Design a protein around this ligand. Sequence first.
Ligand SMILES: Nc1ncnc2c1ncn2[C@@H]1O[C@H](COP(=O)(O)OP(=O)(O)OP(=O)(O)O)[C@@H](O)[C@H]1O
Ligand SMILES: Nc1ncnc2c1ncn2[C@@H]1O[C@H](COP(=O)(O)OP(=O)(O)OP(=O)(O)O)[C@@H](O)[C@H]1O
Ligand SMILES: [Mg+2]
Ligand SMILES: [Mg+2]
Ligand SMILES: [Mg+2]
Ligand SMILES: [Mg+2]
Lengths: 592, 593
Amino acid sequence: HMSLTDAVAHLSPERWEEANRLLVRKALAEFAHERLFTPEPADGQDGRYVVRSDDGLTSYRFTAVRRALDHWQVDAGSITRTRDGAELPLAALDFFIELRHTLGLSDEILPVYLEEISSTLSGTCYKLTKPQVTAAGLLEGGFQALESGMTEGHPCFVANNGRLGFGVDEYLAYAPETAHPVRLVWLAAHRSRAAFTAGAGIDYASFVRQELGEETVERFDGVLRGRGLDPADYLLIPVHPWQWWNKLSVTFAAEVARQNLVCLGESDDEYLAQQSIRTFFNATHPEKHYVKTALSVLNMGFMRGLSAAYMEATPAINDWLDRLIDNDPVLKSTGLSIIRERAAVGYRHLEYEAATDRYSPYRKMLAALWRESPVPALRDGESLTTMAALVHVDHEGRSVAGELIARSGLAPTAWLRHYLRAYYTPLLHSFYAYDLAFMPHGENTILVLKDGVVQRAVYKDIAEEIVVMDPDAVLPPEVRRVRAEVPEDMKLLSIFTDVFDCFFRFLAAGLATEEVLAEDDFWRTVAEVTREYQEAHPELDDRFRQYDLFAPEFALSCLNRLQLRDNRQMVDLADPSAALQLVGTLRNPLAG
Amino acid sequence: HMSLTDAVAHLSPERWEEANRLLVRKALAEFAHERLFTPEPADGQDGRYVVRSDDGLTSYRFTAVRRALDHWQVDAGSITRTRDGAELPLAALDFFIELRHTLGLSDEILPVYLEEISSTLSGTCYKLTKPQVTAAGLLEGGFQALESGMTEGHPCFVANNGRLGFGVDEYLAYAPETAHPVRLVWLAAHRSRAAFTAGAGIDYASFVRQELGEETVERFDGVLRGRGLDPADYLLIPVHPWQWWNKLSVTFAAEVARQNLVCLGESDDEYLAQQSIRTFFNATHPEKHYVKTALSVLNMGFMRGLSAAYMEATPAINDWLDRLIDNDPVLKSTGLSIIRERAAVGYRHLEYEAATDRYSPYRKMLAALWRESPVPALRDGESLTTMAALVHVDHEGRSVAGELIARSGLAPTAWLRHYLRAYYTPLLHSFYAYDLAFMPHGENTILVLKDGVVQRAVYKDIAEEIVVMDPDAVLPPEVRRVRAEVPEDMKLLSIFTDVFDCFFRFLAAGLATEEVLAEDDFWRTVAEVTREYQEAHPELDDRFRQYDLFAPEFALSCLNRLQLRDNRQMVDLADPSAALQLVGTLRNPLAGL
Ligand SMILES: Nc1ncnc2c1ncn2[C@@H]1O[C@H](COP(=O)(O)OP(=O)(O)OP(=O)(O)O)[C@@H](O)[C@H]1O
Ligand SMILES: Nc1ncnc2c1ncn2[C@@H]1O[C@H](COP(=O)(O)OP(=O)(O)OP(=O)(O)O)[C@@H](O)[C@H]1O
Ligand SMILES: [Mg+2]
Ligand SMILES: [Mg+2]
Ligand SMILES: [Mg+2]
Ligand SMILES: [Mg+2]
């Protein structure tokens, strides 16, 4: 009963009530932003709104402050729910069922979507169990206290933390917000099925020696020899323990039995799950590589396995981009860097390949890559934070961005100006000069701080995410795969959607509500940095006109709509712009 | 490394080779029986045949003895696989991929089906790790040594032991063939959502006191009071641990958090999973009830959850059948009994009900029932065995049926006659006198043995399985749902398929290959017992002519074809006859005899 009751102790009536209030608040706000419903001003009161269930008989009433880019800052405490003239408790599950038709939830998707909602609420309950920490307290804790202290997740997606596949015990062991140390499972994979791809400067033997140590390498060698096997025929693959215990040991039982796969045991180092869940920071040795693992759990619109076939191209692309950054003085002056995916390993399951198509999750169950740590490059007085921290608000209403602005002693617009030159200017130059787009959200960006000021930004998650939006661009063989055909009037969405509407809308609204920086000042600083860039590069004036960042309007691209339409595979990934749902337009805050 | 490497130690190259040979043997045999392919005689040798892949380029060659009911006794040692003029190793996964179109495996189902094959093979490797035990050794061990010592599973279905949802550690903890003790998880379920239904003579308070004991009852009471709750508002529901840790604490987290469900902790008694996986025998107190739990894993064509809505009528239906058995002298003279489903509890998840349709697995995640133990009724010198043991063959080639025949000192036909009067005669009478059909396979039947002789049969798995094949039958209200509309020329399949073609085919073939009893003698004995029943009841002659058990032929109803067509829900269950795949006819072994 003790471990049994402890595992569910975070699930209490009061925490569940709070979690539901918060999640329904987010659902009202973001589903309004995407025009799934239009909140109508309420019968008495001004600034109070009502949204009704599908059949009209249930009313959700609330107050909200409206801000730029159609942002609805819904007040959590103001939300009421009424049916038949009686107040009802707030329950996100009932919410989605009552609105199943308005929100476009098919009968096939709704039950699974409700599981993701339930897990997101359970995660909020666990996070409410943790010690309260201020923004300053997080900064004092450091890089991983910030990483595991984030509570919101992706700011747009309501059903963003499902992690479907975790039992509650596995949730407690593996969720990044629990910050429990994890030991990776190491497998020996026969070279008839497994391939190791080394980035520029990497050598397999020395790479493995540096990552594991001579003693552990010798122990693994001895396991293989104890089985009568030649270690030279095998490669090392680290795996998430969930994947081993629940998928590889069962789904790949034939590979284990025939000794195509050999379980070597656990790593000596202790690892911490990052916000992506499936990527691990090495806590014992922060200078060692991240390990990104295949995890066949559902989270935020995709199964989180990792494609064995694509590992073959991954290090080279990083090398290519790394050279591009290094040879461009505009990018060099911004201090931009990437933490490269340096090495990758993939296992090709021949029978499942014969049994499936190219995009199956069965081809994504066993692969791993290693990513450079950002810690070694730190200079004196510098510290690291995930960019998501900028829009994390603590129990007192203080955000990390606000705490940093205060601690720095600079004017808010000046602090913002440094942040924008580190993070946003490189995106402008990549787009205009190279047709290059990232996916630069809060989880894919790390900020280097000194004296409370953003010194420079580090990008990650590269080979899977970058796009060169020119099908006929001249590119080296191993990089030519990132080219894509994106319609002309959608290319600048890489800035409009991914930067403005999916991150800056939240940061500007937060800093305004926090009474640190007014909306007009935020967006004026953004416009100033944009023109500061463009006026410095008249050789691109034509492209500046072709892709006008100062147009009066741009398309509203809805993110939740993607997940509500297809829970398991939000976008094709072979044609990712085909699933986008642009619903009208937003007024560009840069129009002035 | 220690627990990691131990958990997969049963997965070795030699055990995997043996498992793949055995499973491909079964696939050739049963897919031939169901006419998915027709083995072509290989020129030159009398009993050698060849089966080819979809593209014709891979050949599986084997010897087989052909037996009644189109039974193919494929010899495991003879199987070879050749492609492009080269011999290849035997691999069940490759077999199904090579034959995906011949077998009707869609692109959606094939990968999941391969997972079921892989887990079946892994279970065989584990079973190969266990101490070798003879048929006599199993009989010496007793009821649960036999229950967990069964190795085949269902004799028709090739992908019969998937248990999809178990990780390898959960396999080791929960699979019936590992026989590791299990402690059930007890939940308190609020009476606004959970309902307890008792059979006649059952009382909730005394029922729980007898099953748990006053100490545990009060401990659970104190858990509820410690949270400020009134125990009178709650009911107890036992749950499979896998179900709690993987489904109820996550999928029903809203119910746990709001205290509609309260985790009370583990039971004191230790339980053993039975062949059905989700039903548990109480090892600490064998006289106490079985607990059948909801288990949302896929096995042999169905998710194994338990419907909350059906619980309310389950005890009453059992009571009804019990009285029927009790008032009929023909059934009484056979010694037939059922172990009743005596109590049941169901949890109605209102949000998931609103979000799904009546067939959803989401409505089958939280329910339980309690089934009488057969141990108390045992008399002096009597022992118990699953009927599945009769077709279990040990490492020396002796079946448990052969061991019992030898130990009894009876001639094989005389032994068989006692077994048939206990097991088969009640099925004849249920059909002809009541339009009643069971699902009487090896796992749903327990045999009572004395002096190596079958004294009587115990039927289980009742309310969800019985069918009254008469839509206008006069029945008490709470029982009327067991009525069904079955096409006329399919009603007698309840004997032809479920008894003859799905169990006696294997028993007869096995006792013949074992050189205990010739096929003709087996089937002649079955014919004799059939006439022994029918001649004793001339008032039913019309029905005997209407449903002729001596007809020259009857339909071949294919079992694997169902699972190959629909991995997750082999049959509708609102209309179970519509999914059946009849492919030609079989020669009735009783036609001559
Ligand atoms: N604030 C955040 N913004 C964006 N994604 C987030 C955030 N917090 C958590 N995530 C998680 O990160 C994942 C999506 O990000 P993405 O595809 O970029 O990561 P990945 O490829 O899985 O991992 P990595 O970034 O280590 O390569 C989802 O699992 C999502 O829920
Ligand atoms: N020899 C066997 N014959 C039939 N089924 C078997 C056998 N061995 C194991 N089984 C398993 O029993 C299960 C299906 O049987 P059925 O639906 O009759 O039982 P249940 O309702 O799950 O459990 P219970 O019999 O306890 O009520 C499957 O999981 C099947 O694979
Ligand atoms: Mg990422
Ligand atoms: Mg990614
Ligand atoms: Mg059964
Ligand atoms: Mg059943």
